[PDB]
Design a protein around this motif. Structure first.
Motif, PDB file in Angstrom:
ATOM      1  N   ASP A 187      10.027   2.496 -11.635  1.00 50.86           N
ATOM      2  CA  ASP A 187       9.208   2.493 -12.846  1.00 50.86           C
ATOM      3  C   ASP A 187       8.161   3.595 -12.824  1.00 50.86           C
ATOM      4  O   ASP A 187       7.863   4.193 -13.863  1.00 50.86           O
ATOM      5  CB  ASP A 187       8.529   1.136 -13.030  1.00 50.86           C
ATOM      6  CG  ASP A 187       9.495   0.051 -13.452  1.00 50.86           C
ATOM      7  OD1 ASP A 187      10.499   0.375 -14.119  1.00 50.86           O
ATOM      8  OD2 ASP A 187       9.247  -1.128 -13.125  1.00 50.86           O
ATOM      9  N   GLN A 203       2.369   5.294  -6.332  1.00 48.43           N
ATOM     10  CA  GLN A 203       1.466   5.650  -7.423  1.00 48.43           C
ATOM     11  C   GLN A 203       0.835   7.014  -7.164  1.00 48.43           C
ATOM     12  O   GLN A 203       0.756   7.865  -8.063  1.00 48.43           O
ATOM     13  CB  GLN A 203       0.375   4.585  -7.583  1.00 48.43           C
ATOM     14  CG  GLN A 203       0.843   3.164  -7.883  1.00 48.43           C
ATOM     15  CD  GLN A 203       1.521   3.022  -9.226  1.00 48.43           C
ATOM     16  OE1 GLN A 203       2.722   2.779  -9.300  1.00 48.43           O
ATOM     17  NE2 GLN A 203       0.752   3.164 -10.298  1.00 48.43           N
ATOM     18  N   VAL A 256       9.303  -0.577  -8.182  1.00 49.35           N
ATOM     19  CA  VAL A 256       8.059   0.172  -8.265  1.00 49.35           C
ATOM     20  C   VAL A 256       8.288   1.673  -8.316  1.00 49.35           C
ATOM     21  O   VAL A 256       7.806   2.326  -9.250  1.00 49.35           O
ATOM     22  CB  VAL A 256       7.137  -0.180  -7.086  1.00 49.35           C
ATOM     23  CG1 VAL A 256       5.923   0.733  -7.058  1.00 49.35           C
ATOM     24  CG2 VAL A 256       6.694  -1.615  -7.201  1.00 49.35           C
ATOM     25  N   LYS A 311       3.499   1.139  -1.942  1.00 47.03           N
ATOM     26  CA  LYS A 311       3.702   1.188  -3.388  1.00 47.03           C
ATOM     27  C   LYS A 311       2.530   1.879  -4.077  1.00 47.03           C
ATOM     28  O   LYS A 311       2.720   2.624  -5.050  1.00 47.03           O
ATOM     29  CB  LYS A 311       3.890  -0.225  -3.942  1.00 47.03           C
ATOM     30  CG  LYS A 311       5.122  -0.970  -3.456  1.00 47.03           C
ATOM     31  CD  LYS A 311       5.085  -2.400  -3.976  1.00 47.03           C
ATOM     32  CE  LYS A 311       6.320  -3.194  -3.595  1.00 47.03           C
ATOM     33  NZ  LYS A 311       6.404  -3.449  -2.134  1.00 47.03           N
ATOM     34  N   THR A 325       0.829  -1.191   0.000  1.00 45.57           N
ATOM     35  CA  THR A 325       0.000   0.000   0.000  1.00 45.57           C
ATOM     36  C   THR A 325       0.872   1.251   0.000  1.00 45.57           C
ATOM     37  O   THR A 325       0.435   2.307  -0.467  1.00 45.57           O
ATOM     38  CB  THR A 325      -0.954  -0.078   1.195  1.00 45.57           C
ATOM     39  OG1 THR A 325      -1.624  -1.341   1.149  1.00 45.57           O
ATOM     40  CG2 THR A 325      -2.012   0.973   1.130  1.00 45.57           C
TER      41      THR A 325
END
Lengths: 179, 1199
Positions: free
Chosen positions: B1186, B1158, B1183, B1154, B1152
């Protein structure tokens, strides 16, 4: 999920608003920490989680240990795996669990477990019971747990023995209010 | 300097203890040499051919050679030390063809005494050179003592001193008795060589069979005893009784007077002496050949079913000859030089297969298609083809002696099926079992491919070929050759432009016919001269020769348009038609094998950018309908300033030629169009090609990103240095010095400049206008050292050579570090620039040895000093008396030493102008005594920053600090004050309290809820750890901060003031604009970040950029919700710390987290996120990597 870093890679590139994921757990025997943490961290991809236990031997006592990170959970199924009392207390510990199934419990249901702390699953609606080893007083305190939860919509009490005159307490617990 | 001698001991002694072994009877073979002197690393600037013929030998490891006379390892072959000469300082037919061309003039000296003294005649007017000198000369007078002239013409020739100073044995016991005289240099098994059927003769390695008479060559150290005698004498009768025709099969798979006298006539004609002539010295016309006076190239031997087979050499062509063969290269250049090389050196006979090749035939078919065979062109472009022998009987002399006939056929690309015996010979190549060669370009290899076994490619090796040609032909000038080789490692892609070795004659005319390159040697002059040769060669009018120049110039616009290099052959809307003009012009070609739609290729990929520079001046100083809208169009497609340094350096430095200046103000207007931007970073970093300093260009991005990493104004200062530098070179070389001058004054202003004047002749045009810069900077971190590298890719020299009498020179800037000496010459430079400038900015950074430098500095200078920074000095008395006695001081920051200045303090309370201090870590209850000496002086004060260790006297402080009319930023901290009433009086009796730093003084904040309502226009407030409950300070500071909507920077500390203070305070700071910095250290438990969550959902926040939530109690999925909305809906923020909860905070639900990554990647305008005080893993590294690469606008994630 048969018997897995590729699917860990698959969910671990982009994360979007998945609604629900269904987890098919099949015959977990080997149990190393790397798969515990990876398969544990996969399960936050969706907004709801449907966990399926299918004859998993290594998860006889590792229920709360793996699912400790897994806060997201919606329903769960139990298919022919050993289980402890404190793991049932972990089942009743979570509140987002709405639907629960359990099948093929050969061992006697210990007190202080699922049926004794039953009234915590405050959003229970679909409950499935099959092949549970109990006695009369366990069915009585089970029905005392049935007096607590008032949002149930669907009940299965299939294939039960040693339940002489417990059905008066169960049906008495069910026929109280217009549920 | 010395490191080549100490390092010479390092690797030369490390190699001296390594590879002393030398088999000085073995290393004389030629084939193993030119085999293994070919395919080694080859990164030097030295020819392997005549180093294989220098007298030394080497394997292929880093250059370590040895010898037989002076047995020592020698490597590290670098400039100007010729290894044939360094061999010395570290210790029949040619004479016949010479005097064949003997003229009538030179007969005061006899030719036969020139024959008896070692002279070679080159077939021109009366000019000679020796076989191993290289200098052809005339200048014949009377009394020329010929060998003594050779010791008297020039001292270059050290060949001067280097040369001057059986019938009864026909049985194997008697044959073997002759074999007992065995030479030592052959380690081959002697007994099998006895049983091979030979017997020895008496010389080096020839040997004489008795049955047939086999003796012949190819005898070396690792050969086979039987093999050469089988596969090169297949009719030896003793071998026929030993191994018959079915047994020579494995060796087969291993490896008439008119005809004969015709071979004697044509053999006498094909050794032509005037056949040597080539226009490679075209207008230079130097007296010399192109084999003994020029180096060579190699063979990229490529198989037909796509393996790149080998890279053979020129005798390796002779080893396994091809019966029909094609080579690719350049006509006029190497390919016809390779054919005329074969014939002219076939008139020499040195290789151990030569003199036994029978009939070569040189032919160039670009002129003819004459539908007639041998007599047409042999009688046309050569002498004749015989009349008693018919043209088919000449073809019968071909088809009767086929096995040694060698062909030198050129340019089927300008040939059709019209010649009869030619094209029917090529299409029926079996019917003459001959060796056929052809030299077609890479546009039409496909028509030859039906009749090929292997393909051959000519390729330059510009490691050593360009310095061999420019060495030998330009030994007249060798310092610009030093400029060339030092330029080879300043610009390590110098091989990336030298792509054809026999079109370097433009460089030859750009040394002997254009002496301007001798003082202007960089790249654009050189290949500008190559382009000027492309105007001179094929001199014509404005045909699509010229529209091939412009149209392939817009092929180059498509080249750098979308960074496409090997083309698609779809959009021929740029150039299109008459491919013979574009390949004859040779600006491009196409693909050889199958593609779906075949692929264009270039002679040089970076040379294409120079073609686009020709396109840019064509689109810069020509018809203004839409042409300069195309040059303006792509010239606006490149509009990012961080890309401007590298891409505009290489490409716009290609534009720095062609000085026409009809829209040079438009492209330097594009240089002024570059403004303060951030996305230019990955505008450059996204691109693919970087031209010459290619991994260095990656490093340029790394270092400039490091410049913006620390200092925004030093990064833009370096941007100003490269933009004003390349714009200065382009402005002066474009000669738009009075055309664009006030626009350049717009290009100057506001930018702070560090003092770089060594391109002063570009700058000194009008320095008085070019003098209104914002600042001037010198320092002595690694930035200026890298700039020393950058011109390396002085001050008063360019500065006073710039202006003999400067005028109104602006203000100055000084930084010094701890590694500084006191050399007085740079102090005289400081005397000049302090005598020039307005005043000085001055920064002392730990500089020891500066007391002995500040005494002559202030001794030479007068009383004009503004800023002095006193970073960790020694604090001695004399230099602060000398600093003390100069008036008009304005700025002095003092924040470092526990040792307290006293005379500089109480005597600093005398003068006027001072506005900067500092009092960090001093301690003073009683030092304030002559401070009321300052109290009549200065109502001019702009920086106050005090620290004491204990309580001072406060009546003077409330008195004259009450008497301040011109308040400013304040730094106050850290003592046992215990007086809110004097500070309440002075802060209640003033006017302009708008930047307050009160970071952590022992103080009761009852004052602040009284004096914060007295002033509303505050902008910056900092506070460190104080007492802060949740009803007294929360309600009273909720009102006092609640009426303070003018603030920009907020730093609130360390209380149990709890989420009601987040309700009212996060309410009001949520609802005030013009706010940038916000910090909630040691506070904000998770309901207060619920307050920043629901508060941060609605907005009113869009001005904010900086924010700190260091020291929570616990961040978890709670913090995923609160930092989900709060780190979601606010697209201007850039600062976040989540840290210092140090022991175990992996209770964050990492996946979460990660999802929170986002969520941070939702935020566009962020820079620095600090995710400290928890574990990562491999997964969230991938993560945040990217999703960090989704928009690269951020760079600072800190673990």
């Amino acid at each position: 999920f048969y018997e897995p870093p590729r699917a860990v890679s698959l969910f671990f590139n982009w994360k979007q608003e998945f609604k629900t994921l269904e987890v098919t757990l099949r015959d977990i025997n080997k149990l190393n920490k790397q798969d515990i943490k990876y398969l544990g961290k996969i399960f936050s991809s969706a907004t709801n989680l449907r966990l399926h236990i299918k004859r998993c031997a290594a998860m006889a006592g590792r229920l709360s240990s793996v699912l400790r990170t897994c806060k997201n959970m919606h329903t769960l199924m139990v298919e022919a795996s050993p289980l402890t009392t404190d793991d049932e207390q972990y089942i009743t510990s979570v509140t987002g669990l709405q639907n629960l199934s359990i099948h093929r419990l050969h061992t006697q249901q210990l007190p202080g477990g699922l049926i004794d702390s039953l009234g915590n699953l405050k959003n229970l609606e679909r409950l499935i019971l099959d092949d549970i080893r109990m006695n009369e007083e366990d069915a009585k305190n089970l029905a005392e747990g049935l007096r607590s939860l008032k949002k149930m919509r669907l009940l299965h009490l299939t294939h039960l023995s040693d339940i002489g005159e417990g059905m008066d307490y169960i049906v008495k617990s069910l026929s109280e209010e217009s549920c | 300097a010395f490191q080549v001698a100490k390092s010479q001991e390092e690797e030369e002694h490390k190699e001296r203890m390594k590879m002393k072994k030398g088999f000085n009877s073995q290393m004389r073979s030629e084939a193993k040499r030119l085999k293994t002197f070919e395919t080694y690393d080859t990164f030097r600037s030295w020819t392997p051919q005549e180093m294989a013929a220098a007298g030394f030998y080497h394997t292929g490891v880093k250059l370590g050679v040895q010898c037989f006379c002076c047995s020592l390892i020698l490597f590290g072959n670098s400039l100007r030390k010729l290894p044939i000469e360094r061999h010395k300082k570290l210790r029949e037919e040619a004479r016949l063809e010479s005097f064949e061309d003997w003229p009538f003039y030179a007969h005061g000296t006899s030719p036969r005494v020139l024959s008896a003294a070692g002279f070679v005649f080159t077939g021109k007017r009366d000019t000679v050179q020796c076989f191993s000198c290289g200098g052809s000369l005339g200048n014949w007078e009377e009394g020329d003592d010929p060998w003594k002239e050779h010791a008297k013409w020039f001292p270059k020739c050290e060949f001067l001193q280097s040369k001057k100073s059986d019938s009864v044995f026909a049985n194997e016991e008697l044959r073997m008795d002759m074999f007992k005289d065995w030479p030592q240099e052959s380690p081959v098994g002697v007994e099998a060589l006895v049983r091979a059927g030979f017997f020895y003769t008496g010389k080096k390695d020839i040997v004489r069979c008795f049955s047939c008479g086999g003796c012949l060559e190819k005898w070396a150290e690792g050969d086979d005893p039987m093999e050469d005698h089988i596969k090169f004498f297949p009719e030896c009768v003793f071998l026929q009784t030993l191994k018959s025709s079915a047994e020579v099969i494995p060796t087969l798979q291993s490896q008439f007077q008119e005809a004969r006298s015709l071979s004697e006539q044509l053999r006498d004609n094909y050794t032509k002496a005037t056949f040597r002539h080539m226009n490679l010295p075209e207008v230079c016309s130097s007296l010399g050949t192109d084999h003994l006076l020029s180096c060579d190239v190699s063979i990229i031997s490529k198989h037909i079913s796509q393996p790149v087979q080998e890279a053979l050499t020129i005798p390796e062509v002779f080893s396994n000859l091809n019966s029909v063969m094609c080579v690719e290269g350049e006509t006029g250049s190497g390919k016809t030089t390779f054919l005329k090389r074969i014939a002219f050196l076939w008139a020499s006979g040195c290789c151990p297969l030569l003199y036994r090749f029978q009939l070569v035939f040189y032919l160039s078919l670009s002129s003819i298609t004459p539908d007639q065979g041998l007599a047409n062109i042999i009688c046309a472009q050569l002498l004749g083809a015989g009349g008693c022998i018919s043209e088919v009987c000449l073809s019968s002399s071909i088809q009767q002696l086929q096995h040694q006939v060698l062909f030198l056929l050129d340019d089927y690309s300008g040939l059709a099926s019209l010649p009869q015996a030619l094209h029917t010979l090529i299409t029926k190549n079996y019917l003459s079992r001959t060796c056929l060669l052809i030299a077609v370009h890479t546009n039409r290899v496909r028509d030859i491919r039906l009749y090929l076994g292997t393909s051959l490619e000519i390729q330059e090796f510009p490691f050593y070929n360009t310095v061999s040609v420019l060495r030998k032909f330009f030994s007249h000038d060798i310092i610009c050759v030093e400029k060339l080789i030092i330029y080879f490692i300043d610009n390590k892609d110098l091989q990336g432009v030298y792509k054809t070795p026999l079109f370097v004659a433009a460089v030859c005319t750009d040394w002997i016919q254009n002496a301007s390159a001798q003082d202007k040697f960089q790249d654009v002059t050189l290949f500008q001269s190559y382009m000027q040769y492309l105007s001179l060669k094929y001199k014509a009018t404005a045909e699509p020769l010229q529209a091939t120049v412009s149209s392939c110039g817009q092929l180059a616009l498509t080249g750098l348009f979308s960074s496409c290099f090997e083309f698609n052959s779809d959009d021929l809307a740029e150039a299109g038609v008459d491919e013979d003009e574009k390949l004859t012009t040779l600006l491009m070609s196409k693909f050889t094998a199958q593609r779906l739609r075949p692929v264009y290729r270039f002679l040089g990929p970076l040379f294409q950018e120079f073609l686009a520079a020709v396109r840019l001046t064509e689109l810069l100083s020509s018809d203004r309908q839409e042409d300069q809208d195309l040059g303006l169009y792509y010239l606006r497609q490149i509009d990012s300033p961080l890309k401007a340094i590298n891409s505009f350096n290489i490409f716009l430095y290609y534009v720095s030629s062609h000085s026409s200046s009809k829209a040079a103000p438009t492209v330097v207007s594009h240089l002024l169009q570059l403004v303060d931007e951030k996305e230019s970073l990955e505008n450059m970093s996204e691109n693919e090609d970087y031209m010459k300093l290619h991994p260095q260009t990656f490093l340029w991005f790394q270092f400039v990103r490091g410049l913006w990493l620390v200092s925004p104004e030093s990064s833009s200062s370096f941007v100003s240095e490269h933009l004003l530098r390349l714009a200065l070179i382009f402005a002066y070389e474009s000669n738009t010095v009075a055309e664009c001058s006030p626009f350049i004054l717009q290009f100057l202003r506001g930018k702070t400049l560090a003092l770089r004047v060594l391109n002063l002749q570009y700058f000194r045009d009008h320095p008085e206008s070019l003098l209104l810069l914002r600042s001037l900077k010198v320092s002595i971190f690694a930035q200026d050292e890298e700039i020393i590298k950058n011109y390396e890719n002085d001050i008063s020299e360019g500065y006073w050579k710039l202006s003999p009498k400067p005028c109104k020179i602006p203000k100055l800037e000084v930084q010094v570090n701890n590694t500084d000496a006191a050399d007085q010459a740079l102090l005289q430079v400081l005397m000049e620039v302090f005598s020039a400038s307005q005043s000085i900015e001055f920064r002392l950074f730990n500089s020891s040895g500066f007391l002995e430098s500040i005494c002559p500095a202030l001794e030479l200078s007068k009383a004009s000093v503004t800023k002095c920074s006193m970073s960790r000095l020694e604090l001695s008395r004399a230099e602060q008396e000398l600093l003390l006695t100069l008036p008009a001081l304005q700025s002095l920051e003092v924040s470092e030493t526990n040792q307290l200045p006293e005379q500089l303090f109480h005597n600093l309370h005398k003068f006027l102008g001072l506005k900067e201090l500092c009092v960090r870590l001093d301690g003073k209850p009683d030092v304030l005594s002559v401070l009321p000496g300052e109290f009549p002086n200065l109502h001019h004060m702009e920086k106050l920053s005090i620290r004491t260790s204990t309580e001072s006297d406060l009546s003077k402080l409330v008195k004259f600090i009450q008497n301040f009319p011109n308040l400013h930023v304040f730094h106050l901290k850290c003592d046992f004050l215990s007086n809110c009433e004097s500070l309440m009086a002075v802060l209640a009796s003033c006017k302009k309290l708008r930047e307050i730093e009160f970071s952590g003084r022992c103080f009761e904040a009852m004052t602040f809820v009284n004096i914060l309502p007295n002033f509303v226009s505050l902008k910056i407030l900092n506070l460190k750890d104080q007492q802060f409950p949740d009803k007294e300070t929360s309600e009273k500071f909720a009102q006092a901060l609640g009426s303070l909507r003018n603030l920009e920077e907020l730093l609130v500390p360390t209380g149990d003031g709890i989420h009601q203070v987040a309700k009212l305070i996060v309410r009001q700071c949520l609802q005030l604009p013009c706010l940038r910095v916000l910090t909630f250290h040691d506070i904000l438990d998770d309901d207060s970040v619920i307050e920043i969550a629901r508060a941060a959902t609605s907005g009113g926040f869009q001005k904010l950029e900086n924010l700190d939530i260091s020291m929570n109690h616990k961040i978890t999925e709670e913090g995923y919700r609160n930092f989900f909305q709060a780190l979601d809906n606010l697209p201007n923020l850039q600062e976040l710390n989540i840290c210092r909860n140090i022991p175990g905070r992996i209770q964050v639900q990492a996946t979460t987290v990660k999802a929170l990554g986002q969520c941070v990647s939702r935020l566009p305008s962020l820079i620095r996120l600090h995710m400290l005080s928890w574990l990562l893993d491999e997964e969230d590294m991938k993560v945040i990597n990217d999703v960090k690469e989704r928009h690269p606008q951020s760079k600072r994630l800190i673990i």
